[PDB]
Curated annotation (Swiss-Prot), chains A, B:
The gene is Trpm3. Constitutively active, non-selective divalent cation-conducting channel that is permeable to Ca(2+), Mn(2+), and Mg(2+), with a high permeability for Ca(2+). However, can be enhanced by increasing temperature and by ligands, including the endogenous neurosteroid pregnenolone sulfate and sphingosine-1 and suppressed by intracellular Mg(2+). Implicated in a variety of cellular processes, including insulin/peptide secretion, vascular constriction and dilation, noxious heat sensing, inflammatory and spontaneous pain sensitivity. It comes from Mus musculus. Coiled coil: none annotated. It is found in: Cell membrane. Disruption phenotype: Trpm3-deficient mice exhibit clear deficits in their avoidance to noxious heat. Trpm3-deficient mice display reduced hypersensitivity to thermal, but not to mechanical, stimuli in carrageen-induced inflammatory pain. In the chronic constriction injury (CCI) model of neuropathic pain, intraperitoneal injection of isosakuranetin or primidone do not reduced heat sensitivity in Trpm3-deficient mice. Homotetramer. Interacts with TRPM1; the interaction results in the formation of a heteromultimeric cation channel complex that are functionally different from the homomeric channels. It comes from the Eukaryota. This is Transient receptor potential cation channel subfamily M member 3. Disulfide bonds: none annotated. Belongs to the transient receptor (TC 1.A.4) family. LTrpC subfamily. TRPM3 sub-subfamily. The chain holds residues 1234 to 1266 of 1732 of the full protein.
Amino acid sequence: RFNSSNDERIRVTSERVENMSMRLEEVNEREHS
Amino acid sequence: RFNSSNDERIRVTSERVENMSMRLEEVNEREHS
């Protein structure tokens, strides 16, 4: 019941979005053409 | 306490999602290969 509340889902989504954004910036920085 | 509320987390997630979508739309168009 704790892991499926709105607050925890929002927090986990925010953390994963932050990590995904950082990784996507790192990937776009890595380019050869 | 302000930085960990639901409203601020939703706003930051929305902004980062918008930025990620804008970046991925131009990563996809990088189709020289």
